[PDB]
Every structure is written in C-alpha cells, then in structure tokens.
Amino acid sequence: AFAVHVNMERCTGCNNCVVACPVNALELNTVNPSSTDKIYKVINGDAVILDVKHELCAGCGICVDACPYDVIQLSGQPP
Amino acid sequence: KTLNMITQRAVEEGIAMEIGKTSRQYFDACSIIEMNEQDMKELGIMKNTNVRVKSESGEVVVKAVVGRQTCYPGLCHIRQGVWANQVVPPRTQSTGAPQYSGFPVTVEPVPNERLKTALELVQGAVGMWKG
Amino acid sequence: ELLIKNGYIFDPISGIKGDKADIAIKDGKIVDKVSSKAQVIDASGKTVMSGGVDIHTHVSGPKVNTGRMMRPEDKFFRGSYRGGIIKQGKRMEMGFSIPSTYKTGYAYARMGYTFTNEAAMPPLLAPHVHEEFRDTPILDQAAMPVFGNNWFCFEYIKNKELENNAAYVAWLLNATKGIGIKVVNPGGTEAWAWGENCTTINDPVPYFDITPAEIVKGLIETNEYLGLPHSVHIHGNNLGNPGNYKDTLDTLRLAESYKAKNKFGREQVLHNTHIQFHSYKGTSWADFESGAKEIMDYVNANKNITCDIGQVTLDETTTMTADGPFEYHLNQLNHIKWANVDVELETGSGVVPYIYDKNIKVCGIQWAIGLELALYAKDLMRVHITTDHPNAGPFTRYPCVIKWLMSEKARKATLDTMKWKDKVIAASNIASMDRELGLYEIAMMTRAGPAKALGLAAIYGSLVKGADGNVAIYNLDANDLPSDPELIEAAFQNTAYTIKEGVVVVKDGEIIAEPHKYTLWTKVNMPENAQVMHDIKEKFTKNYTVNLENYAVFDEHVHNPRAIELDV
Amino acid sequence: PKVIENVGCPYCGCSCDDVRITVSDDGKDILEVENVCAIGTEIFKHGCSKDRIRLPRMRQPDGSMKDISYEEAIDWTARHLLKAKKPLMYGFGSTNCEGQAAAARVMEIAGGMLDNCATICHGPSFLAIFDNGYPSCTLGEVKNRADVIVYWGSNPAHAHPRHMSRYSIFPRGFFTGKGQKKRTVIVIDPRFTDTANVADYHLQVKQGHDYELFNAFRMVIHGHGKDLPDEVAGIKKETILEVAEIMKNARFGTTFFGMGLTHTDGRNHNIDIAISLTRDLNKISKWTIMAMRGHYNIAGPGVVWSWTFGFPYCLDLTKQNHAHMNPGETSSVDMAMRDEVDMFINIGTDAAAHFPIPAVKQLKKHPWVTIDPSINMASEISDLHIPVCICGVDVGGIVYRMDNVPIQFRKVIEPPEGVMDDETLLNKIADRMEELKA
Amino acid sequence: ETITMTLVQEPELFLECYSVTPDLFAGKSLAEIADLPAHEGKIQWKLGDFFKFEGKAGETAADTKIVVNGNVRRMKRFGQQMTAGEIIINSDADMYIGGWMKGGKITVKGNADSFLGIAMEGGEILIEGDAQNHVGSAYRGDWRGMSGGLIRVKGKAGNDIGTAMTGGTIIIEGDAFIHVLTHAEGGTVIIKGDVEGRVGGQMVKGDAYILGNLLYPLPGFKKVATVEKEVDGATYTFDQFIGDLGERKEKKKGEIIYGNIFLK
Ligand SMILES: Nc1nc2c(c(=O)[nH]1)N[C@H]1C(S)=C(S)[C@@H](COP(=O)(O)OP(=O)(O)OC[C@H]3O[C@@H](n4cnc5c(=O)[nH]c(N)nc54)[C@H](O)[C@@H]3O)O[C@H]1N2
C-alpha cells in the first residue's frame, strides 16, 4: 500500500513501467484474474499513477528497476 | 586532445525537433557537448560553458556539459542536428554513409562567445543570413 | 465488340481439337453471336487457345521482395543486364529472376497468360500482397493464405472442432482476401521457429503434439466442408532430399476418404505441388535416382489427386519457399546468401540463390525428373505446368519447358550438352522416351487443368459461352509442328495477339495497353462463432503486435476484387 | 470527446499502432492522446495546430518568401524537372507507400536520380544484406519466443522509446510467460546508455573496434576460442566467453543493430560480419539479426522500389529504360560532393539540417524545392516550399515497420482546407510533365 | 593502328563514355567513331560533340589503340568490357575504368576514382596515381568477382581492396586502408606500405602479401611459420599468419586450406 512518485519532467513515455508492474500484469496474464485495477497508464506521454489512494502497490521495485532513465522514486515510509 | 567523437540521439532531442527545428527547445536540446568529467578537468572546461569543437571539416561553438550516459575517458558526443553536422566530416568510404560517429576533433575552452542558432548556422553557411 | 475469325481452336473444356471456330467476345464475356460492328481479327493459320491460367507462382509477397532486395546481382551481371533492355510498356522491366511487378505482368501478357495465383502469403502480410498486385499490369490475380502452421489451426485440429476451424478459415479468407488454403511443410515450419524440422509425416510439433498427418486431414475436412473453390494446395514434407518418394506417397495417401463437394466443378480434393521436388529416390546425392514412375503410378491410380510439375529450367535462380528448414539446408550445402523471415504465429520463409547448372549430375537428374513425371501422365488434365517460379526457374522459361515436352530433339540436345550425360541417363529414364505431348495436351495442362482445378473454369480457362473473354493467339499452325524446336520456343514466347476481357493488349508480342485487372477472393457467408471471435480477440491481445482492427485489409486497399461467394 | 482507437504514431521504426486519440467535438482539435511516447505526443500536438502552412511559397528576388497557387508551383517544378539534366529527389523516410510509388513514377518520367534516407542511415546495412543475406524475423516472433536479446550498437531507450515495452523485453509472450525475468539482455556500445541501465550485461567496447569484437565472437563460436588474445576491443576474454556461452545456450536469440555499426569504420563490413555471426549461430541455436530502422515508413521506399525497379535505393534512372544502382556512385551525398546534380527536391526529410554542411553548400548551387507540411531547415533554404499532408494525422495509408510488416495508419484530422497530399501532388506533377510532352 | 582523342568542349557534368573501347573503335570510319553514343545527365551526346579524332583504327580491337589527351578527369566507364587492344589516359580518370575487362591494358597516367577494375577477368592496369577505394572489388551483391588479370596502383589505395576476389592479383605500390581481401576466395594482394588493419577478414582462402605494418591485426589470424618469399621482389622472409579462423574454410583432399596472410 506504498506510494510511488513519477518525475514527469524526465518521463519519456517508454511504457516499460506499465508493462512491468506485476499489479498491472494481473488482468491479462493470470488465470481467473483477481483484481483488474492498474497503477500506471501513459497519458499524454508521461506515466500517470491511477493508484491515487495508495492501495495496490506492493513495494516490489519491478517498476523502479524497469524505467531506463531512473525517474520513479519508491517511498517505503507511510505517506 | 585528439579526443575521438561520436554523434547520436536523445529523447529530449527528438522531442525538440518535433516541437520545431527553429524552436528554443531545439536550440537547448541540440547545442550540447556531452563529454567525460575526467576529460573536462584535464582540458580545463568549466561545466556548462561554451567550447570550440573544431574538426578537420569545420568548427562549431557548443555548450559543454556532462552526460549521464557515461562516456569513457577520451570520447565526446553531440546530439545529432545542425550543430553536429556543422562539424561532421563528409567522408563516405564509397558507401554513402558519412563519418557520423568516430571522427577526431580538438576541443578549446572558449567562453564569452555566443552560440549560433540553427537558422544562423545553416543560412550563413549557404550565404543567406539576412537577419 | 470483337470477333476472332478463322483460327484453330483448342478448348479442352469443350473437347475442341483444331476447329476453325469463331469466338465473339462481347463486353468481356464470350458470346455466341455479335453483329458486324465488332472489329475483327484475321487469325488465319494461327493456333488460338484461351487466356492461360497459372495455378502456382510466387509473383508477389514479402518473400519475393526480400529476394529482390537481397539479390541485385539478379538485375545486373558481368556488365550487361541479364533481364534484357526494354520499355515496350509505359514502365520498365528489371530482373531476370524475380522480375519487378511491371516485368511479371508484361511477360505473362506476352506469354498469353491472364490469371496468376500467387501461391503463398502469410496472412499478417496481406497489405503487401495487395499493394504489389495493384502494380502488376494486366494479369488478374488471387493469392492463397497459408493455414498449415497457423497456431489457431493447431489448436482446433488438436481439439477436433470442425465448425470452429471452418469459421476461422472463413474469417481469415475474408480478412486477407485469399482464394484457398496452402499448407507449406505441415507443422514443420513452426518447429523451425525453434530450429527443428518435421522430417516425416508422423512426428509431433513442439508443444502442440499435433502431427502433419492430423493437420492435413483437418484442413481437408474443413475445406471440403466449406466447399471452397480451390482444394487444399499442399507442399509436403522431407522436401529436397533423396529417398522422399516414400514420404510423398505417405502424404498423398491422406485423401483416400474424401469427395470434392462444391457448386464449382473440381475433382481434386488436394493438390500436390512441385512434385519433381518430392519425387526423389535413393540415400544421398551419389546414389540418387528418380521416383517419378512410382509417384505417377499412384497419381494415375487416384482420381481425387491432381498435381503439377516443378520442371527445372537449368539456369541461375533464387529459390523462395515459405519453409525455413529446406532453405537453411540448401544454404549449408552451397555456401551462398540466405535470408530468413519468420512471421508471428503463422509461417516461416527462406530465400537462397542457387545454380541449376548443366555441369552437375544432380542438376541433370533434377531436370530429367520433371519430364519423366509429365511424360508418364495418362491423364494430363490432372498434371499441370508450373516451375514454382522462381524455385525451379523463371517463368520466362515456360516456352523452354513446352519445347522440351513437345520435341524429343530438344531433350536429346539438352542431354547431350549436359556434362554427366552417362550418369544422368543411368540414373534416370528420360533418354529413351518417345512421347511428345501434343498441342491439344499442352493446351489442356496449361489452360484447362489449372482452371478446372481452381474450380473457376466458368469464367477462366475456356472459350465456352459465358466465360471471361481472355484469348491468346499463337503463331504456330496446328497442322504441322515446326521442325526446329527453337521455332516452338519463339512461338510460345511471343504471342501474335492477346486479349484481356475484350481489349487487345499484345500485338506481334509488343504491349499495346493495360485497361485494368481483378483480384479474386472468396466470400464465405456464414454466421459468426462467438467461440472463434473470443479466441481471436484473446490471441491478438496476448500474442500479435498489430491490432485486430488493423489486421484486416481495409476495404480501400484492394484493387477491383470480384469475390467468389459461398454459402454456410 | 470522440475517442478514436487504433491510430498510428508516425515517428520511429516501431510504427506503434496502439494509440488512442480523443478528438474534439468538431473533429479538428486533438484533446488528449493516450498510450504514445512523448516524441509521438508532440507529433500529434503539432499536427492538430491551428496556425499551419496552407499554400506554397516562392523566393522573390528580394530574398523574402511569398505564396503562390498549387498549380503555379506544379508548373514551376515540372518545367524545372524537364529542363534539368540530372535532378535528384531525396527523402521518403516519412511518407505513405503510395507517396513512394507516385515519386517513382514522377522520376521515371523525368529521368533523374531517385533516393531515400537509406543511403545516410541503414544503407550500409543493405549493402551487407547484398553480400551475406538477412536472417531476420518479425517483432511478434521476438515478443513470443526470444530468450536472449542483443542490442549491438543501438539505444532503444532514446531512439525507439516503446520498443522495449512492446516487442523485445518486458512483454509476457506465449512461450515467454515469465516475461523479462527469463530474458538475457546484452547491450554493446562504448557509452553506458539507458539501454545498458536496463540491461543485464554490458560490453563497453572501444568505439570503432566492433569488427574485431565480432571476429572474436565468431572464433569462439567456431570452437577454438582459446586462440583469442588476452583482451579484444577493450573487452576481456572471460567476459567474451561468458556472453558467447549465453548465446550458444539461447533457445531463440535476436540481435538488433544501429548507428554503432552503420555509421563507423567499415560501414557495411560491420553489418555483414554481424550477419555472418548470426548465420553461424543458427548452427546450434536459432538467431535472427534485425535492423533498427528509423523512420516509420523508411522500409517503404525499399519495398516499393524493390517491386518497381528492383533496387532499394541509389537509383540511376537516367537511361530511361534500364536503372542502375551503385551506392558509392549514385548516392545523394556522393553526388552532392562531386557536384553531379542539377536540382534537389526535398520530399519527406530535412536535408539542410541533417546533411553535412559541405554537401549542403555544394547542393545549394542549383534550384531547391521542398515538399514538407511544416517549416524546417530545407524549407528555409529552398526556392519554393510546397505544403503537404502529414501521414497518420491528416492522411492514412500503408507504412512499413522495422521488420517490413505493413501497418495500416488511420486519419484523425482533416487537413487544412486546400492542402493536398504527396500522392495527389506527385501525380499532378507527372500529369503536367506529360502535358509538357517529355 | 592508333586513335587520338582530344577534349575540345568541356562537359559541365560527368560523361558516361562507355563507348570508348577498342571493341567499339575497331574497324570503324572516323565519322562513325565520332558519332558513337555517349550519355551525359539524362541527355545522350554523340561523342563527336566532346572530342576531336585523328588516327586510323584497326580491323580488330587487338590491333587498335586509343590515346585520350585531354582533361578526361570527369569521364567514367572508360575501358568497360574491353576484350583486347590498348587504352591510354594522359590525365587522371573517374569511376569504373576497366570494369568487367577481359584483356588488353589501360595505362592511366594519373589518378583514378572508385570501382577501378570492378570484376576484371584479365589484362593489365598501370595507374601511377592515388586510386580510391573498391579497387578490383566485385559488384554489390555478388560472390564471384575479380577472377584474373593485374592491377598496379602506384599510389595510395583505399577501402575494399579485392573484395570477394577469386583469382589474379592486385598490387598496391603505396599503402592501403581498412578491409583488404574481405570475403575473398583466392589470388594475391601485394601491399607495400602501412595498412590500418582489418586485412583478410571473412577470408575463406587466398594470399595477402604485406611489406608495411599492420596497425590493427584481426584476432582471426595466428602466426604459424616464418617463410622466405619472392613476391614482386626477392627474399623478404615473411612470417605468415594462417587463415581467418572466424569464417568457415573450404577443405581440399585430406587437408583444410587456410587463407594465409603474410607480413614483413
Ligand atoms: N528522439 C529521437 N529518436 C530517434 C531519432 C532522432 O533523431 N531523435 N532518429 C531515428 C532514426 S533516423 C534512427 S536511424 C534511429 C537509429 O537510432 P539507433 O540506431 O538506435 O542509434 P543511436 O540512437 O544513434 O545510438 C547508437 C548507439 O551506438 C553507440 N556507438 C557509437 N559508436 C559505436 C561503435 O563504434 N560501436 C558500438 N558497439 N556502439 C557505438 C552509440 O554510443 C549509441 O549508444 O533512431 C530513430 N529514433
């Protein structure tokens, strides 16, 4: 239930934070999908986090490790 | 000093051209040297200061910065565009692909000199610089 | 609108042998009688046939464009252009093999041909094929989507859903605007995507555990159930290796339990192509002889199997087949260029130059095999002429094939100029063979064979009433054949006239005009299956880079279609 | 608020077609664009502009630039194309495949030199394809099967942004359900690029020594790799052996290359040693080279002129009935160097910006015509600037992806009242030239 | 026995004078020779519009002999497919000199542009200038290229020397640059000066004598012996390297044959 922050100023729209998030990958890549909500979607060229109320993230670091030009900061402390 | 050099891409550069080749965004994105920190110290180049990149097939005054994409000691880099092609040598080796990456160049710290805009560079190379 | 007065007629579909009949084309379709306002053609002493139909030729597609790129030696060689220099038409003609689209169209027009069936097309790459077709000049043209390595047709023939697989074939055909079904190396081409090959008819595909036999049978059941015009055109397995006549018989025995049901006239149920490639014998290339005798004994037995020959024209060519393993094996044999184009969830590809020169025992026997096949045919209506252009030679060498058939002096000449004549005659049978196919037989297996097999003899391939007015007049007289076979070569190379739906397009062998062309497809009308709709949507979401709404060729990217409609 | 699906982004080789546009009520303003990268976002934002060129514009004696009618511009270009002796038409990177067919017809009528951005970009690669072949694949193949991925001399993060998230690394395919975590990504280039950040290996090679690197790899593959020196091209022998072992054990590999190979010493020999390496690896594994083509339809001129004249680029259409091709002799840059031209036509590119300035100086001695939708350097040093529609925004058509797969682009905005597209324009030029009876 | 050509009108662009060969000049009247076709741009000139002739050609090309005495330094295609005879260029030259030649000899007294001797099959060339790259190189997209004859570039060569060479010999009396004898299969290349490197890449078989200094040796060659060899000279005591181990090797009767590059 952590909080992710995306630096819009250096986001290129690469979409490798959307493809690599394992909560996004739940809908289409799971047998009998449990939850179909998504943290990121690239609207107007930058990654927007729809997870406003910080309910779905799991601090996995797959998205921080994925962005090619580090731009996603993961906060492990309560918002 | 011989300081081998390459010319490549960057997203800010692509973004800039699609804003427009005559835009302040394009100027800021392309007029850039991305060299090594060790080379900058050894040459005597202050970070974020104009510098004279002079190869055998031209010359250009370009801002000198340090790039995240770590160039090893002895490499330079200009984001491709007007400024880089002011200094790219035209040798093709009978293939039609000019020496766009890997030509020697000398670098001279020359602050207090302005940068030349894209229009000024091209229209003055041709002889059309009305302004 | 036009009448061709007083020319010998050869219409196998009407059983006409050398009659001085008159064809009165009227607005594109042949009609019995037209008034005296029609411009006439004095074809006296000239052999008239119908506008030839080609059933198997790769005159377009991504394979062919990959060949054209990869091979610029093809156009230019030793200082001079091997394609010849000519601008008869409004455009250029570049290329000896794999000619540019403007050369293929003009060369077929000069041949007399009018319909060409571009055999293999990956379904994903349909706009490419329809774009090259817009640029081919006069020939009407259809293309056959490849369904023998589609993953969707691996699932359905695994799980035994005839209705679902039929709905999928109808959807594909309606998307890629195809006209039939081609199985290229059943199953094996997909194992090539991992690097293996299906060397027989029984071995399973990796991860799918379906076999070539099962997939061929499933596609035959699908085809004859939907009643598509053309049958399951089949490539085969173990191509291009010695001893594979046994496997060719094994794959031909897969039709022994089906009957061609459709509203179009065709007696095939499957069409086994370039069989001189599948009719090898022996262990290796030093103990290698011809199995054409056995192959044609089986074909002469079975009446639901029709064939064509892949006669090699003994020259330099590039070989393009949709299967990878054969091309890779050929590259490892001859150490020349090799291009491979794997498609996503669908097929493979391979382009490799090859030299069919006269100075090799292997190439000599390969040349002899196709002649043995054609000269062992008791019924010629079932055995057609192609060259798998360009796999066995360019189409501009069709008249050479016809010369070889129609004059044994030509075959003696070639066998004598061949280097290892002793080995070739020892390991073949074509040295002592008298048969010279008659002009009626050649018209049969060039015009009526392909048309009737495609099940569109109503419009193409014959001069009977109501057919499409495509006529090709030749120089030679039917009463006495030429003494010098080069005369036959020239006579079939250059046509005295050629009409395309009523408009003369070739005169004396010189292009005259190019009105327009049609691109035939199949229009199966049937209620959709929710199951296949769902499976297709799922598979495009997970597996295909292109989108479902951008896979189907847009209604504006096809060039004068004229569908062939169906029911259920 | 009229959401339009399945649009095409017309900039990089990826030809991404998963773009969603929310066009305004009147169908002429783009409000929000989803699923596209920034470079693309900006293309659409520029296409939907309100203040854009609508009429041609001529250079008067005073040096300013005033508008003229389309028929007058067509007349000018036709008369000049006929009067010239060896005109050169360059560009075609950013146009539909009908735009590259109409141009072929126009220059067939004229008799000049027809050429595209292949010469200065991946033409050295084609020259290697001519030598060795092109063992390749479509991109869904690497999406659904690839176990090892090599980015030799390329930088997808900044060249093709959504390449990694669409085709190569992160997508979970069919046989690669585990996604990235079973893909081994190797990136080779002297810089430590963002692709190398995402990668798992990195072979920081001396710029220009890729031929020695490839030869080392191929000796390893051929088996007696013990004869390698201590280090090769700055890469250390044990790391060479590590990467080579991974490549050998790959179930299905794929190599991508770019300017690191096509713009350095030994332009085409780097590419053909790479292709030789791929053909050698297919002995024990499955490996497929693949070229990182730049513009959307830059593979479109290749295929269209392949089917028309048989030659992908550097076309010598001066004999008027047989064409010739020799990149060292018929290419735009070499002809500009040896002042072998008489007229330069800027169609779908920016020659002034992206050519060497000696070549631009040599070219400007002659008349100069630009057919672009918007202002750029060529349209600023040209003699007249003819506007034209933008592919994928104002006009649709076929385009050709990196791997020669045809995507069908859609139209989202109607072009400004008056502006035509290149196929209509080139056809009108050809009609007028035939009217002038040459 | 001889023909004399002298440039009278300078052509603003490059003239593709492929028609200037002993094969086309043999047994022709002076007016006919003056009206042989010649292209320029998209226009076709008559070859009397740019030259002035004074001589008598022979009944056979093996008899005739052309001498060009002007600034023919923007003329290309001289000697194309020349079967026998003689040509002299008393100046420099441009692209495709001697292309696809099958005999005779070309004595360019000056420089030369690229593609000199493309796919040559016999005969001689005697350049004394600085030939550019692709000297003796096979045409783009081919595998069997130069297969005989002699090329003698007495100056600085360039790239792509002897690409896909099959037989014959290319002698460069000066030095060279990258990519010598790539894709080759046979023949010799005798470079007598500094070479940047990349010599012998992709080689399947062949010989490459070098008397200068390789600055970038490819990893694919290993030293196996030190041999004395009389190549264009006398005993220079070469230390041969063996084969391009990177590329597959043709095998002969009971032995694998390597493409051995020599050195000083
Ligand atoms: N934003 C933006 N995107 C673009 C473009 C643009 O201009 N701006 N251009 C588009 C087009 S036209 C092109 S062709 C494509 C091509 O783009 P790419 O083919 O992907 O190549 P580059 O982006 O230039 O980066 C090439 C990498 O090779 C490295 N390199 C340089 N020299 C060497 C060498 O000698 N050896 C090795 N191993 N590596 C070397 C370079 O450091 C660089 O990391 O991008 C397209 N995408």
Ligand SMILES: Nc1nc2c(c(=O)[nH]1)N[C@H]1C(S)=C(S)[C@@H](COP(=O)(O)OP(=O)(O)OC[C@H]3O[C@@H](n4cnc5c(=O)[nH]c(N)nc54)[C@H](O)[C@@H]3O)O[C@H]1N2
């Ligand atoms: N220093 C350096 N310079 C280089 C390179 C390098 O590596 N280093 N690489 C060179 C290479 S790889 C090339 S690709 C060039 C790339 O450079 P270019 O090929 O010139 O690419 P762009 O400048 O983006 O050209 C885009 C122009 O085409 C217009 N356009 C868009 N769509 C259409 C259309 O449908 N029809 C028409 N008529 N016009 C349209 C666009 O508005 C724009 O004006 O860069 C080259 N220059």
Ligand code: SF4
């Ligand atoms: S930390 Fe994990 S769960 Fe959270 S947004 Fe990133 S990838 Fe998704």
Ligand code: SF4
């Ligand atoms: S991965 Fe990084 S650069 Fe790409 S969209 Fe996400 S935050 Fe932006």
Ligand code: SF4
């Ligand atoms: S990767 Fe290229 S094609 Fe795809 S969205 Fe970005 S700019 Fe457009």
Ligand SMILES: [Mo]
């Ligand atoms: Mo490019």
Ligand SMILES: [Zn+2]
């Ligand atoms: Zn086949």
Ligand SMILES: [Zn+2]
């Ligand atoms: Zn075929």
